Amino acid sequence: TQQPEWTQAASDLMARTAALARKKANGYLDPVHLAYVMFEDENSLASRVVRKLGAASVKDGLEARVDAIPTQMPAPTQPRPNSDMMRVMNTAEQERVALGDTLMAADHFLLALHESKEVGRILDAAGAGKKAIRTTLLEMRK
């Protein structure tokens, strides 16, 4: 199993994901947390992909989906990836290898978000399906 180095940005996206899940008192880290984090800043990579596609804005809907995760009483101090999050992370690694990239990066997380049905259904409705995201990232990497 490859243990690649991560870009600082990728590590920070995961730190922000963990901080979000903790602040919500949720039991696990979910892809929905990572997706919200990736769309939180208006000039983030994911936000700029949506902009280039003319996709609808997904921030508020992802926040609602985060707020649909049960508030646990008491919540864990260190919530861990659930099985959906593991699948997203495994797909991100596949995408890193397929692109020939040395470091795990935000791009790879974005290419993996559609492994979650709950994230993917929001992105799909907005006009940012898996194939469209891939094509847009390819243009942006030029």
Q: How far lies 129's CA from each of 23, 26, 49, 75, in Å? A: 29, 27, 11, 33
Continuous segment of H or E residues that includes residue 139: helix 130-140
Render the burial of 26-64: b for 16+ CB within 10 Å, e for the rest.
bbbbbbbbbbbbbbbeeebbbbebbebbebeebbebbee
- Domains of the chain, CATH where assigned: 8-141 (1.10.1780.10)
Burial class (CB in 10 A: 0-12, 13-18, 19+), 7: middle
DSSP state of 6: B
Reported resolution in A?
A: 1.1
Q: Is 129 helix (H, G, I), strand (E, B) or coil?
A: coil
d(CA 85, CA 32): 9
Q: Which tokens hold the place of 117?
A: 């049905």
Using what technique was this structure determined? X-ray
SS3 content of the chain, % helix, strand, coil (to 5): 65, 5, 35
DSSP state of 68: T
d(CA 39, CA 30): 15
